[PDB]
Amino acid sequence: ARVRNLNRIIMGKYEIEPWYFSPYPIELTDEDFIYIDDFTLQYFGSKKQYERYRKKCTLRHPPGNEIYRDDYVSFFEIDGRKQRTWCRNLCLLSKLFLDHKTLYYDVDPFLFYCMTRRDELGHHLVGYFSKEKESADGYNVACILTLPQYQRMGYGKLLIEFSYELSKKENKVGSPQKPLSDLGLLSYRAYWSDTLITLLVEHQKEITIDEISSMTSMTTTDILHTAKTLNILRYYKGQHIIFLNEDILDRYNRLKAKKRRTIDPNRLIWKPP
Ligand SMILES: CC(=O)SCCNC(=O)CCNC(=O)[C@H](O)C(C)(C)COP(=O)(O)OP(=O)(O)OC[C@H]1O[C@@H](n2cnc3c(N)ncnc32)[C@H](O)[C@@H]1OP(=O)(O)O
């Protein structure tokens, strides 16, 4: 009698192996897989069951308001309390790739911003980031995740950039919840670096900390840490600034050479509560 662990999830054409254990309320059997509907995120122990529900009539995108939509991606804002089932399913899926995550069942305190890529086939959920409706620490992100099958395609940086656009619209600085996984922290460091580098080349050769946080919603701490890492911190005109140098120009051009997609602030149709 085999009592197997969940060793693989079948999502669309993808067969993904979890990185960590997730509390799916499922029976342990001699099989080690479950089906995850790429639209509803519902889990099924049998292909037949999955098929049975797949036929049902359902929207083909996350259950929320589309507050951002460009030719590349869309962002849906979902209130956990309004979509408990879907969000709980999202959290169970997310935990498979997180060392730790708050109780998956309690989604009420969060707002989920799910990003989809649109094809000739429609919407495809590629990642998301949750956010406390009320954060005592002012965290502008709780967990952020790019589904495994879509990682290392630039989606994570888009998720992060979007979280800062919300903060900017809110007229507040923000920073991701600590502690961050290594993957998460390294992604933020790259984003913060790319951001200061782009500002120095496209905005001004010299910029004060205040100006930076005002334009990016990045906190003083994240700005200083990033500036020190790049060796671009100085004192000019009576205050601390970051400055441009050949290294930064080089980095900027290399960044641009990758012709990466970015978020257009003008397409964010959203008002904070
Ligand atoms: C806040 C918190 O509670 S934190 C927890 C953070 N989340 C996790 O740990 C969950 C598991 N991990 C993940 O979901 C992901 O690893 C994340 C979100 C941390 C990062 O997401 P990703 O989609 O992989 O990010 P992204 O692709 O933008 O990262 C850039 C990397 O992709 C590579 N890349 C992007 N597009 C391309 C492309 N077209 N061709 C080749 N490489 C590419 C970059 O070269 C870079 O590699 P590098 O980091 O060694 O320099």
PDB file of C-alpha atoms in Angstrom, residues 18-190:
ATOM      1  CA  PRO A  18       6.829  21.235  -6.318  1.00  0.00           C
ATOM      2  CA  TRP A  19       9.790  22.740  -4.435  1.00  0.00           C
ATOM      3  CA  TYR A  20       8.102  22.553  -1.035  1.00  0.00           C
ATOM      4  CA  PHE A  21       5.118  20.902   0.659  1.00  0.00           C
ATOM      5  CA  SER A  22       1.690  22.548   0.384  1.00  0.00           C
ATOM      6  CA  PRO A  23      -1.329  21.653   2.587  1.00  0.00           C
ATOM      7  CA  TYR A  24      -3.709  20.609  -0.190  1.00  0.00           C
ATOM      8  CA  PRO A  25      -6.678  19.033   1.638  1.00  0.00           C
ATOM      9  CA  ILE A  26      -6.366  15.850  -0.403  1.00  0.00           C
ATOM     10  CA  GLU A  27      -6.244  12.147   0.287  1.00  0.00           C
ATOM     11  CA  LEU A  28      -2.832  10.498   0.164  1.00  0.00           C
ATOM     12  CA  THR A  29      -2.955   7.655  -2.376  1.00  0.00           C
ATOM     13  CA  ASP A  30      -0.715   5.442  -4.492  1.00  0.00           C
ATOM     14  CA  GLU A  31      -0.557   8.257  -7.057  1.00  0.00           C
ATOM     15  CA  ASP A  32       1.677  11.323  -6.715  1.00  0.00           C
ATOM     16  CA  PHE A  33      -0.045  13.911  -8.893  1.00  0.00           C
ATOM     17  CA  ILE A  34      -3.033  16.243  -8.914  1.00  0.00           C
ATOM     18  CA  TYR A  35      -4.537  18.364 -11.664  1.00  0.00           C
ATOM     19  CA  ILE A  36      -4.662  22.128 -11.245  1.00  0.00           C
ATOM     20  CA  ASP A  37      -7.075  23.940 -13.577  1.00  0.00           C
ATOM     21  CA  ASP A  38      -5.111  26.852 -15.070  1.00  0.00           C
ATOM     22  CA  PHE A  39      -8.176  29.104 -14.811  1.00  0.00           C
ATOM     23  CA  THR A  40      -9.980  28.140 -11.599  1.00  0.00           C
ATOM     24  CA  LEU A  41      -6.840  26.835  -9.860  1.00  0.00           C
ATOM     25  CA  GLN A  42      -9.045  24.052  -8.484  1.00  0.00           C
ATOM     26  CA  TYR A  43      -7.270  20.762  -7.716  1.00  0.00           C
ATOM     27  CA  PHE A  44      -8.313  17.268  -8.820  1.00  0.00           C
ATOM     28  CA  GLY A  45      -7.011  13.818  -7.954  1.00  0.00           C
ATOM     29  CA  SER A  46      -8.307  12.312 -11.185  1.00  0.00           C
ATOM     30  CA  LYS A  47      -7.919  13.399 -14.797  1.00  0.00           C
ATOM     31  CA  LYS A  48     -11.551  12.398 -15.324  1.00  0.00           C
ATOM     32  CA  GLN A  49     -12.686  14.727 -12.533  1.00  0.00           C
ATOM     33  CA  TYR A  50     -10.582  17.562 -13.931  1.00  0.00           C
ATOM     34  CA  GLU A  51     -12.123  17.028 -17.368  1.00  0.00           C
ATOM     35  CA  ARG A  52     -15.641  16.950 -15.940  1.00  0.00           C
ATOM     36  CA  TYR A  53     -15.198  20.425 -14.430  1.00  0.00           C
ATOM     37  CA  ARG A  54     -13.087  21.780 -17.298  1.00  0.00           C
ATOM     38  CA  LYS A  55     -16.155  21.515 -19.549  1.00  0.00           C
ATOM     39  CA  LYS A  56     -18.160  23.849 -17.292  1.00  0.00           C
ATOM     40  CA  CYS A  57     -18.752  27.449 -18.360  1.00  0.00           C
ATOM     41  CA  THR A  58     -16.232  29.777 -16.712  1.00  0.00           C
ATOM     42  CA  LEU A  59     -14.400  33.042 -17.360  1.00  0.00           C
ATOM     43  CA  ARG A  60     -10.940  32.612 -18.830  1.00  0.00           C
ATOM     44  CA  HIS A  61      -9.010  34.972 -16.549  1.00  0.00           C
ATOM     45  CA  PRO A  62      -8.536  35.784 -12.814  1.00  0.00           C
ATOM     46  CA  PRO A  63     -11.727  36.718 -10.872  1.00  0.00           C
ATOM     47  CA  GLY A  64     -11.132  40.423 -10.400  1.00  0.00           C
ATOM     48  CA  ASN A  65     -11.160  43.919 -11.866  1.00  0.00           C
ATOM     49  CA  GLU A  66      -8.732  44.434 -14.741  1.00  0.00           C
ATOM     50  CA  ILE A  67      -7.047  47.635 -13.557  1.00  0.00           C
ATOM     51  CA  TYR A  68      -4.197  47.456 -16.084  1.00  0.00           C
ATOM     52  CA  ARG A  69      -4.138  46.259 -19.678  1.00  0.00           C
ATOM     53  CA  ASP A  70      -1.494  46.783 -22.349  1.00  0.00           C
ATOM     54  CA  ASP A  71      -0.611  44.757 -25.460  1.00  0.00           C
ATOM     55  CA  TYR A  72       1.571  42.387 -23.407  1.00  0.00           C
ATOM     56  CA  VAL A  73      -0.110  41.765 -20.026  1.00  0.00           C
ATOM     57  CA  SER A  74      -3.136  42.474 -17.831  1.00  0.00           C
ATOM     58  CA  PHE A  75      -3.381  42.860 -14.047  1.00  0.00           C
ATOM     59  CA  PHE A  76      -6.438  41.805 -12.092  1.00  0.00           C
ATOM     60  CA  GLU A  77      -7.038  43.150  -8.593  1.00  0.00           C
ATOM     61  CA  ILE A  78      -8.816  40.592  -6.427  1.00  0.00           C
ATOM     62  CA  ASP A  79     -10.136  41.165  -2.909  1.00  0.00           C
ATOM     63  CA  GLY A  80      -9.495  37.909  -1.055  1.00  0.00           C
ATOM     64  CA  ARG A  81     -12.693  38.266   0.958  1.00  0.00           C
ATOM     65  CA  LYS A  82     -14.678  38.484  -2.291  1.00  0.00           C
ATOM     66  CA  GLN A  83     -13.034  35.464  -3.933  1.00  0.00           C
ATOM     67  CA  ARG A  84     -12.143  33.187  -1.017  1.00  0.00           C
ATOM     68  CA  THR A  85     -12.164  29.893  -2.908  1.00  0.00           C
ATOM     69  CA  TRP A  86     -10.090  31.085  -5.870  1.00  0.00           C
ATOM     70  CA  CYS A  87      -7.597  32.942  -3.687  1.00  0.00           C
ATOM     71  CA  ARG A  88      -7.241  29.985  -1.310  1.00  0.00           C
ATOM     72  CA  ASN A  89      -6.473  27.828  -4.341  1.00  0.00           C
ATOM     73  CA  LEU A  90      -3.934  30.427  -5.490  1.00  0.00           C
ATOM     74  CA  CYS A  91      -2.245  30.367  -2.076  1.00  0.00           C
ATOM     75  CA  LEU A  92      -2.070  26.551  -2.022  1.00  0.00           C
ATOM     76  CA  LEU A  93      -0.441  26.622  -5.455  1.00  0.00           C
ATOM     77  CA  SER A  94       1.921  29.383  -4.345  1.00  0.00           C
ATOM     78  CA  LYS A  95       3.047  27.512  -1.204  1.00  0.00           C
ATOM     79  CA  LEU A  96       4.424  24.717  -3.411  1.00  0.00           C
ATOM     80  CA  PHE A  97       7.188  27.146  -4.318  1.00  0.00           C
ATOM     81  CA  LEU A  98       7.630  28.974  -1.000  1.00  0.00           C
ATOM     82  CA  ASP A  99       9.503  27.763   2.087  1.00  0.00           C
ATOM     83  CA  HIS A 100       6.882  29.463   4.285  1.00  0.00           C
ATOM     84  CA  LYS A 101       3.531  31.177   3.734  1.00  0.00           C
ATOM     85  CA  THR A 102       0.853  32.397   6.117  1.00  0.00           C
ATOM     86  CA  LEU A 103      -2.179  30.104   6.601  1.00  0.00           C
ATOM     87  CA  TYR A 104      -3.500  29.567   3.058  1.00  0.00           C
ATOM     88  CA  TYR A 105      -7.115  29.528   4.238  1.00  0.00           C
ATOM     89  CA  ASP A 106      -7.294  33.090   5.560  1.00  0.00           C
ATOM     90  CA  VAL A 107      -7.294  35.271   2.427  1.00  0.00           C
ATOM     91  CA  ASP A 108      -9.589  38.065   3.697  1.00  0.00           C
ATOM     92  CA  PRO A 109      -6.741  40.393   4.798  1.00  0.00           C
ATOM     93  CA  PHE A 110      -5.227  40.423   1.310  1.00  0.00           C
ATOM     94  CA  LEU A 111      -5.574  41.987  -2.107  1.00  0.00           C
ATOM     95  CA  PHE A 112      -4.136  39.853  -4.897  1.00  0.00           C
ATOM     96  CA  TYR A 113      -2.756  41.391  -8.092  1.00  0.00           C
ATOM     97  CA  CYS A 114      -2.586  38.641 -10.687  1.00  0.00           C
ATOM     98  CA  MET A 115      -0.767  39.155 -13.953  1.00  0.00           C
ATOM     99  CA  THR A 116      -1.782  37.395 -17.140  1.00  0.00           C
ATOM    100  CA  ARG A 117      -0.141  37.213 -20.534  1.00  0.00           C
ATOM    101  CA  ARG A 118      -2.596  37.396 -23.420  1.00  0.00           C
ATOM    102  CA  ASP A 119      -2.152  35.265 -26.541  1.00  0.00           C
ATOM    103  CA  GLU A 120      -4.250  34.288 -29.521  1.00  0.00           C
ATOM    104  CA  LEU A 121      -5.438  31.727 -26.959  1.00  0.00           C
ATOM    105  CA  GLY A 122      -6.548  34.323 -24.417  1.00  0.00           C
ATOM    106  CA  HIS A 123      -5.378  34.973 -20.846  1.00  0.00           C
ATOM    107  CA  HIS A 124      -2.721  32.876 -19.116  1.00  0.00           C
ATOM    108  CA  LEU A 125      -1.930  33.447 -15.432  1.00  0.00           C
ATOM    109  CA  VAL A 126       1.853  33.803 -15.132  1.00  0.00           C
ATOM    110  CA  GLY A 127       2.308  35.328 -11.676  1.00  0.00           C
ATOM    111  CA  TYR A 128       0.967  37.462  -8.838  1.00  0.00           C
ATOM    112  CA  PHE A 129       1.808  39.363  -5.677  1.00  0.00           C
ATOM    113  CA  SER A 130      -0.397  39.679  -2.626  1.00  0.00           C
ATOM    114  CA  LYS A 131      -0.611  42.779  -0.470  1.00  0.00           C
ATOM    115  CA  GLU A 132      -1.971  43.368   3.030  1.00  0.00           C
ATOM    116  CA  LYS A 133      -5.026  45.624   2.893  1.00  0.00           C
ATOM    117  CA  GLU A 134      -3.554  47.072   6.070  1.00  0.00           C
ATOM    118  CA  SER A 135       0.192  46.711   6.726  1.00  0.00           C
ATOM    119  CA  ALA A 136       1.588  48.041   9.996  1.00  0.00           C
ATOM    120  CA  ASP A 137       5.042  47.949   8.408  1.00  0.00           C
ATOM    121  CA  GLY A 138       3.937  49.595   5.171  1.00  0.00           C
ATOM    122  CA  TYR A 139       4.901  46.583   3.058  1.00  0.00           C
ATOM    123  CA  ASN A 140       3.723  47.123  -0.533  1.00  0.00           C
ATOM    124  CA  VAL A 141       4.043  43.385  -1.243  1.00  0.00           C
ATOM    125  CA  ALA A 142       3.511  40.244   0.916  1.00  0.00           C
ATOM    126  CA  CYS A 143       4.530  37.131  -1.406  1.00  0.00           C
ATOM    127  CA  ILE A 144       5.281  37.475  -4.968  1.00  0.00           C
ATOM    128  CA  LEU A 145       5.402  34.626  -7.327  1.00  0.00           C
ATOM    129  CA  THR A 146       6.032  33.824 -10.979  1.00  0.00           C
ATOM    130  CA  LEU A 147       4.705  30.352 -11.794  1.00  0.00           C
ATOM    131  CA  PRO A 148       7.662  27.938 -12.360  1.00  0.00           C
ATOM    132  CA  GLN A 149       6.816  27.227 -16.004  1.00  0.00           C
ATOM    133  CA  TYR A 150       7.094  30.985 -16.641  1.00  0.00           C
ATOM    134  CA  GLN A 151      10.094  31.928 -14.488  1.00  0.00           C
ATOM    135  CA  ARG A 152      13.141  33.720 -15.884  1.00  0.00           C
ATOM    136  CA  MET A 153      11.141  35.438 -18.638  1.00  0.00           C
ATOM    137  CA  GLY A 154      11.018  38.884 -17.049  1.00  0.00           C
ATOM    138  CA  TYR A 155       7.561  38.490 -15.497  1.00  0.00           C
ATOM    139  CA  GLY A 156       8.855  38.823 -11.942  1.00  0.00           C
ATOM    140  CA  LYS A 157      10.350  42.243 -12.646  1.00  0.00           C
ATOM    141  CA  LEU A 158       7.019  43.306 -14.148  1.00  0.00           C
ATOM    142  CA  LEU A 159       5.169  42.177 -11.012  1.00  0.00           C
ATOM    143  CA  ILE A 160       7.551  44.193  -8.854  1.00  0.00           C
ATOM    144  CA  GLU A 161       7.389  47.278 -11.074  1.00  0.00           C
ATOM    145  CA  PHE A 162       3.587  47.122 -10.895  1.00  0.00           C
ATOM    146  CA  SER A 163       3.598  46.939  -7.085  1.00  0.00           C
ATOM    147  CA  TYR A 164       5.569  50.184  -7.006  1.00  0.00           C
ATOM    148  CA  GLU A 165       3.128  51.862  -9.425  1.00  0.00           C
ATOM    149  CA  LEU A 166       0.370  51.150  -6.890  1.00  0.00           C
ATOM    150  CA  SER A 167       2.496  52.679  -4.133  1.00  0.00           C
ATOM    151  CA  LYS A 168       3.177  55.718  -6.326  1.00  0.00           C
ATOM    152  CA  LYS A 169      -0.524  56.158  -7.048  1.00  0.00           C
ATOM    153  CA  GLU A 170      -1.060  55.933  -3.258  1.00  0.00           C
ATOM    154  CA  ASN A 171       1.510  58.664  -2.567  1.00  0.00           C
ATOM    155  CA  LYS A 172       3.487  56.380  -0.262  1.00  0.00           C
ATOM    156  CA  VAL A 173       6.871  54.698  -0.260  1.00  0.00           C
ATOM    157  CA  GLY A 174       6.835  50.937   0.166  1.00  0.00           C
ATOM    158  CA  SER A 175       9.048  47.857   0.431  1.00  0.00           C
ATOM    159  CA  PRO A 176       8.423  44.085   0.168  1.00  0.00           C
ATOM    160  CA  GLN A 177       7.669  42.132   3.336  1.00  0.00           C
ATOM    161  CA  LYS A 178      10.733  40.796   5.175  1.00  0.00           C
ATOM    162  CA  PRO A 179      12.226  38.295   5.280  1.00  0.00           C
ATOM    163  CA  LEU A 180      12.456  37.628   1.545  1.00  0.00           C
ATOM    164  CA  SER A 181      13.534  34.341  -0.011  1.00  0.00           C
ATOM    165  CA  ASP A 182      16.927  34.520  -1.752  1.00  0.00           C
ATOM    166  CA  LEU A 183      15.152  34.350  -5.123  1.00  0.00           C
ATOM    167  CA  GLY A 184      12.908  37.221  -4.064  1.00  0.00           C
ATOM    168  CA  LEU A 185      15.662  39.429  -2.639  1.00  0.00           C
ATOM    169  CA  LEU A 186      17.885  38.940  -5.679  1.00  0.00           C
ATOM    170  CA  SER A 187      14.991  39.902  -7.970  1.00  0.00           C
ATOM    171  CA  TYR A 188      14.322  43.084  -5.981  1.00  0.00           C
ATOM    172  CA  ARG A 189      18.004  44.026  -5.983  1.00  0.00           C
ATOM    173  CA  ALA A 190      18.069  43.740  -9.778  1.00  0.00           C
TER     174      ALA A 190
END
